[PDB]
Amino acid sequence: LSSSLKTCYKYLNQTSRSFAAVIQALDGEMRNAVCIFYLVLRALDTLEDDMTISVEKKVPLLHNFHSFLYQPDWRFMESKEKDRQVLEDFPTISLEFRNLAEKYQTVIADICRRMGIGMAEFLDKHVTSEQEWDKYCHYVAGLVGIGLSRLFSASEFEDPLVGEDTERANSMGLFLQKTNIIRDYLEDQQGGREFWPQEVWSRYVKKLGDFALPENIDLAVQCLNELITNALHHIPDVITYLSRLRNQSVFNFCAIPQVMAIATLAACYNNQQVFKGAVLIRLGQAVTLMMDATNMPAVKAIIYQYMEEIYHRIPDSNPSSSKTRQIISTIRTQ
Amino acid sequence: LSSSLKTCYKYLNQTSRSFAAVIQALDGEMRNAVCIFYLVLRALDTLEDDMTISVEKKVPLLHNFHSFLYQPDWRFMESKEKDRQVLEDFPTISLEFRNLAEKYQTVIADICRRMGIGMAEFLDKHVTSEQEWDKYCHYVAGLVGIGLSRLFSASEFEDPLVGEDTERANSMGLFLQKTNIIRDYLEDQQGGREFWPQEVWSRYVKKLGDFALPENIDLAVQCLNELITNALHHIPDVITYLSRLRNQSVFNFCAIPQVMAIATLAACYNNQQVFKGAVLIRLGQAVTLMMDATNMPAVKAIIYQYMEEIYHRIPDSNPSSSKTRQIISTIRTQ
Amino acid sequence: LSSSLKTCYKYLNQTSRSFAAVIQALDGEMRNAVCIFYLVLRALDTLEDDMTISVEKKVPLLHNFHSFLYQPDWRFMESKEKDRQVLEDFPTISLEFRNLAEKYQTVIADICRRMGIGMAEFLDKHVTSEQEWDKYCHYVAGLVGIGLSRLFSASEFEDPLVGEDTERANSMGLFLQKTNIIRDYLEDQQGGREFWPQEVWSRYVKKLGDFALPENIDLAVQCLNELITNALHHIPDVITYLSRLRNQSVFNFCAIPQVMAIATLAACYNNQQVFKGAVLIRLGQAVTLMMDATNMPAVKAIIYQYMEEIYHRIPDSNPSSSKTRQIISTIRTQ
Amino acid sequence: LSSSLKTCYKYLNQTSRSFAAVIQALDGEMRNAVCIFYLVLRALDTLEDDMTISVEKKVPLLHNFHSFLYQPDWRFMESKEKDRQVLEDFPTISLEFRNLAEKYQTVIADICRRMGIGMAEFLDKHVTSEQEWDKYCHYVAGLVGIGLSRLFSASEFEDPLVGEDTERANSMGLFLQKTNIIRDYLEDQQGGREFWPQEVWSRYVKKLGDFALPENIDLAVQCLNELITNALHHIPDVITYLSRLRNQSVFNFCAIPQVMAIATLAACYNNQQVFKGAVLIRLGQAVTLMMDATNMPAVKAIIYQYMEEIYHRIPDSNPSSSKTRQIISTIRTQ
Amino acid sequence: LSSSLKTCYKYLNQTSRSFAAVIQALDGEMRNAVCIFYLVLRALDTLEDDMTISVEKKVPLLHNFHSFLYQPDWRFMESKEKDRQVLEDFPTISLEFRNLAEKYQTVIADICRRMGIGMAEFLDKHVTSEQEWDKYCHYVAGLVGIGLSRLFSASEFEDPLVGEDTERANSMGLFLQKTNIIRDYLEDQQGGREFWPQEVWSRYVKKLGDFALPENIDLAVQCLNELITNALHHIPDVITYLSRLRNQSVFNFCAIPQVMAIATLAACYNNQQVFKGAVLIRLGQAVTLMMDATNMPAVKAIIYQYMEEIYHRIPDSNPSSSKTRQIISTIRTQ
Amino acid sequence: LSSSLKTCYKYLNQTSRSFAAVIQALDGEMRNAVCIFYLVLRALDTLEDDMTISVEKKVPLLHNFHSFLYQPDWRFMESKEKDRQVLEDFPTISLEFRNLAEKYQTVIADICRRMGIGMAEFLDKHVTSEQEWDKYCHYVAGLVGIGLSRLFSASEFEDPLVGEDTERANSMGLFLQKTNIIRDYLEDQQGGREFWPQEVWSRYVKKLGDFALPENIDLAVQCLNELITNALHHIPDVITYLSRLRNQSVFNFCAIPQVMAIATLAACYNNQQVFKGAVLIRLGQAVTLMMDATNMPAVKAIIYQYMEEIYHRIPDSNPSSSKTRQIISTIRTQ
Ligand SMILES: N#CSCCOc1ccc(Oc2ccccc2)cc1
Ligand SMILES: N#CSCCOc1ccc(Oc2ccccc2)cc1
């Protein structure tokens, strides 16, 4: 009924893409809680990406973003991005944020707050060690997973255990993030953003951008494959997180994004396309089309099938051939 | 293990290739009840469809159909339609009808008595107002939903609320009906038949038949869009209706058609093909292919997904552009 | 973290290409129980198919296989079949077998024992009658269905009844064999092995191999259709069996295969290609693709659909046209 | 089915008055796992209590007990304790230990390795410091709680958290150990042992045995009151650990001992008969007369009732009376 | 962890006993909410009870009690009632009251408003009609049944129906107040207080106080029985009320006191001890000693037994014997 | 609010000492159904028991009991048994029975029929062999278990599997019958009725009544023990049966009887005070008074405890020992 709430769902469908539908499917209060949550995240996300905002002007924005949730007339008109509309009409979003029960307000504010400090910290530095790839991924994605779990339990739709287990919640995020950072290498390159860990790619090329020179494609796919091998290590936690859920609408919201992330890594493994444009998700084995990601056992079968897709395609000469089998074997066994 | 009951199920798969499977999949008593219901609804429709039967013979036939269900020896050997075997051997079908529990017999007969009356009024008329469109659809579709619902509740597999809310039940039918009417424009024109409400197509041309003329495609696709917008207004009741279902066999039976209907609508929206033959229902985003209509949340997700598929295609230049956005916007926030 | 168990799952994915994912999706202790059960079953099957092993040498092996499960150093190094590794590295498999709960061990060994006996007894004779065809099938598939059931009941995941009703368990496996047999006619032909019951093809030709002859192709199909008719009689039992399951992961494990089996019978029915190539699985009505084999009503639906694909293709001119219909008729009225 | 297992349970009942019933009530695999875990822990405890064993001879056995679990023939025929049966027929128990799944095996052994180390360590010394009292309880009680917690999570019947949070797991054991030590003052005093932390009783007397003398019981029921106050500090952790449980059998197994533990501390608080024989638990107030420890809220209620049964008997005259009210007021406010 | 909240619970355990434990065992938000509610209610109760407070002065205090909650400094220093501490330190409680969510404060203050209006209204009279008894109990207990209920629905731990249905929430408070009034007859008389409905006892004696005289015993017992039969009527609502609860902590909070009440009526029925001392509620029995009040079916079984226990003890000659049966019959068969 | 119904519940409490309270606790339609089912069974039993009836007038009555349930004016004012009210006022009961859903009537009638046939079959003969003692118990109690199980599934409060498992359903009944048969040796003898099986006591004494003679008290106990041992052999089915129940009210109804039976068996095991008076249930160990029989793990604790009390008192003297041990250890590992 609200005009503002109506407006928040218009932005949800503008800014989002593949999440709007599963979010709107959420039971009861989560529906609005998660919608507003993604909107503020989308706004804070836009502030970080905007390169026309000097770092000295951006740091204060990121740090205090969370405090703007309580400033009715706050907003940013200087954005140049595409999703800048959530920023220009932020007061509309703030308004509904303050209509949420406060148990949701607390979680949302808290996450924005820690995410702001994290985004700022990385404003003037590229990711080095894998250990930091996890740190940067924890700030832009992990916290979101931790945030969502806390809102699920808050609402009483999921067991309080879901939200308490932050480590695994964090993994849900790290998996979707690394997978995305991996798929978008070229999109982020011809964009001026570098996310691939340096202590990794610096073992194959002089500059992360060199992986776009067809002359280093073989070395590029070796790095892609190493990073993919890395992301895979989060699957076990993923399966543990999902296995805990008891609300269908939540399950769907959570299981789907992960299964597409898996199919994606599968489509990208030892795949040259990653460095020449877009890698299209396809179809693996009959059963994948036979059963759908709406129940736990099925999500497992779907995942194991993608795992084999990669397994069966592991080059014996790949610098990471063995570790790739190691984690895949661990996943399918235990 | 009656031979007549086997005959019945043979006729069902013969005259209901589409819903036959799911009907046979229904639990306990709902099964046979819904099977007979479709056979007697098939028969009545067969008489209506039959153009060789004079209005003089057809009117009493439609009007008294519900009474033929208790006349052990009634039969119609003069039909020239294809599903007429249900009329020539109606005694078998009616034998199984009087075989059901009095409670089902009540619903079915009542629908047949009201459907016959209604089908009779429209024998010599076309649909004029949008009101007459809801009238006709009610007579040939809504009642079906109102009858089906009343059967679901009668059996106690679904709460009484399902059978009570005749308005929601009616919408279930109007959505499907209005949808097929929109999709079948062409083949209905190539069959000397009109269903599109005149008060609407008249504002675009002098004859419903003009939409088939290349020179009027633009006007045709504008009327199409309008009528579609009209149809969209039933979505909330459909979601509401489906949301109340507790039994899986019934959910499967009810959800699939509706999803099929929304997809069909998303496919036709702003598509010139609707006027050049049968239109193609295009795939669905990835969040759909990893889901199917077996649990409510997922069904919302598929629906919401197709409405956005439509929102993306709405052109400012369309006369309905603004109402289409509006109703979709409303379905999005409830 | 057992490396044997890891190796075991490597083999499961090497040998049971398909089932592998649904097996791994099994809950708790059924997973390793079923995985190991498939590995030892596959080994046994590999000794029985290897033809470089004289009959005199093979029986003592088939007979004592169930006891080699307890001989830690036992392995076979003379097989020349493709999945011979399960036999050459059997010590690894029996190691993890002896690690299962003693109650599962009891079950598995009992089936391997009774299975070896059956296999041995059919090395010196081909299948003659249908009664004999069910006997061979019981020995290589029926007992597996019985074994899998006793395991489900023992793990307490399923009702005690699942494992007690052996006739139904028997049917789950018979329906599968008869299928794979009917579909692997050609491949099993050029292999020197004959599985079609002598009493059926004997009254169509003199040599089973004849059907491979592009001339009596029409004689073949008639037989093909007569055997498929034989198979269909198992469905009533598959459905009854699947309708008792209550554990989701177990249902997934059981429904899927049965569903692919029926889809295959549909594809093959009246298809001349069964005798010329690899009949591939076709699609199912838009209503089939809307569901998945994960709930009982959907399975019943999918199955019924595949029933129709067969039912309205039955040529009157076929020797089995009347039985092919009485059975599909009986299936529609359970 | 196996005799070895039947024997283990015969021993489970000979060594455990009450506990054998609740362990035997554990679901699926944690039943056998805990029955074996308790038998080896008993055998270990037996070796540790047998005085007719040279320290120079006992230290190795305690440091090496964990390893005998892998030696089929190991056993000890030179004990003269009440439960030597588990020592003389340890091969029977060790056999069933190696039949448990590898994952329960690593837990049980690892805890025997660590337990047996601490046991040996407190052979030549006595409990001095209070945090040394915590250290002792950890080696004979804490670790068992930590062990069981790992078995519960390893079996998936309980959440991963239950096993991961070793701190709360530990308190579970510390609470039962201190309550049991306090209650058995006289018993442990005629047997020739001293578990009461020296740094505590020393402030009140010169020899722990002094508390037994009539002319001292006023410094004895001040020391006793001071310990209970310490133990009381574990409750918050006991509520947290019990609150994470979701399986009924495990909840009954965990909740009862703890409840029986508080009741004991509330029957011994500022009571004199503690130093004049053992103490009895005569019923729990009305609310605790209508509810048993099967659900979490009941358990809390029950626990709070005993806190107040203590809060009332706190004589302002007592020295710890202050922090005693402090801990109690804390346990109830959160 | 506020010392103000710490003390609030100190008083909770100080004033309420049969509630302190279960209140503190309430889930999340309703814990502190209910705690505080019971504190102000006790404060208001203490006032309407202090006889050292001339009217004129009292009326105001009761009327303006709900307003003292928002007046940070308010407090009563002239109370000579044991509980006075909750008034003298009322600020501490008003402090924590204002810390609660708004919707909880809405309920608390609204009840305290009405409760005071009624209390003052009875300052100048005695309960005459049976109606007057029902509504005196409405102002001091029914409203507390309604208060809590609304707090249960606000926290959303219970459906909205619980807080909606005021009649049921009314019978809950009326069953206790009456049970206590009946049982607390003597004590009240010696306290110079009268609550028994005059139009009832006046038919037996000239003054309510006559039941204290040994000579009037028999007649006193018949009145006791007429009142007891009166209270037995709220039982159908009680069972109904408890049937709708879904939260375990809430069920405990509600079932317990009610089951405690029946137990007391069963104990006082036709028991002349009720006029000489206090009655010791004769514990459960063979089937009620097998259960507790943590699940509806159990509670019912418990309720029904105490009913038969009263039934089989009804003397034919008892003036009310005919109704005590009529009602007990209703409860059985409903 | 039905007069005849209120009468039925009045007869339920008269005839049924205890079950009455739990029966009235059943959910929805089971409440009246079982009450009614209990009443007709109390009637049909009163007949058989009546020894002031012929044997040629008793048979038809028994053989035709089930028929009377459809004869409004039926009644039997000729019985001289304690519960003759159910016979003399049978129309009040039949009327209500005819109020039950058809599905319920179906079951109950059927049970009465099959039952009568068995009852009539045993007045001519005596229980000779055990396989016959099972037959009798089957006819007078096992069938009741089957009936109840069916009504449970029919009601849909329990999975269809509950009612489909007639074997364990039978054990439920047999375990009880054998219990009361054993406990009531004198009562049944001082009534001229013999129920103990020949082959058992026969190998002990000549006059089955000899056990009432102080000269063979041993021989009486050893037989007693021998029979108990035969009875304990049903517990596994009992534990399994209860393990299948999902409805609380249904569980309380089933579990409690069983728990009391086992209570009695242990109460009477190797106890001579059985052939000289009524033996009544003692108390349970520590753990039990913390366990109401309302959840399965709890019930298991209780059963395993009683199994233990018996085990501890098995004399090496008694002949049937070893068997008593053999069976009890088997229960320990379920
Ligand atoms: N804006 C922005 S950033 C959006 C992408 O980062 C995410 C996304 C999801 C998420 O956790 C989920 C948990 C379960 C399923 C799906 C998601 C954590 C991090
Ligand atoms: N290796 C080898 S032999 C594999 C083929 O034999 C089967 C296969 C499955 C089965 O039962 C199942 C029950 C339901 C679904 C799938 C299986 C019984 C016999």
Numbering used by the authors:
A (entry chain A), B (entry chain C), C (entry chain B), D (entry chain D), E (entry chain E), F (entry chain F): 36 to 369
Question: Could you pull the original sentences from the published paper?
Answer:
Unlike humans, this parasite use a variety of sterols (e.g. ergosterol, 24-ethyl-cholesta-5,7,22-trien-3 beta ol, and its 22-dihydro analogs), rather than cholesterol in their cell membranes, so inhibiting endogenous sterol biosynthesis is an important therapeutic target. Here, we report the first structure of the parasite's squalene synthase, which catalyzes the first committed step in sterol biosynthesis, as well as the structures of a broad range of squalene synthase inhibitors active against the clinically relevant intracellular stages, opening the way to new approaches to treating this neglected tropical disease. The SQS protein structure had two major hydrophobic pockets: The S1 allylic binding site in which FSPP(FPP) binds to a cluster of highly conserved Asp residues via Mg2+, and a homoallylic S2 binding site to which the second FPP binds via basic residues interacting with the FSPP's diphosphate group.
We also reported the structure of the thiocyanate inhibitor WC-9 bound to CrtM and WC-9 is also known to be an inhibitor of TcSQS. We were unable to obtain diffraction quality crystals of WC-9 bound to TcSQS, but we did obtain the crystal structure of WC-9 bound to HsSQS, as shown in Figure 6A. The crystals of HsSQS belong to the space group P21 and contain six HsSQS molecules in the asymmetric unit.
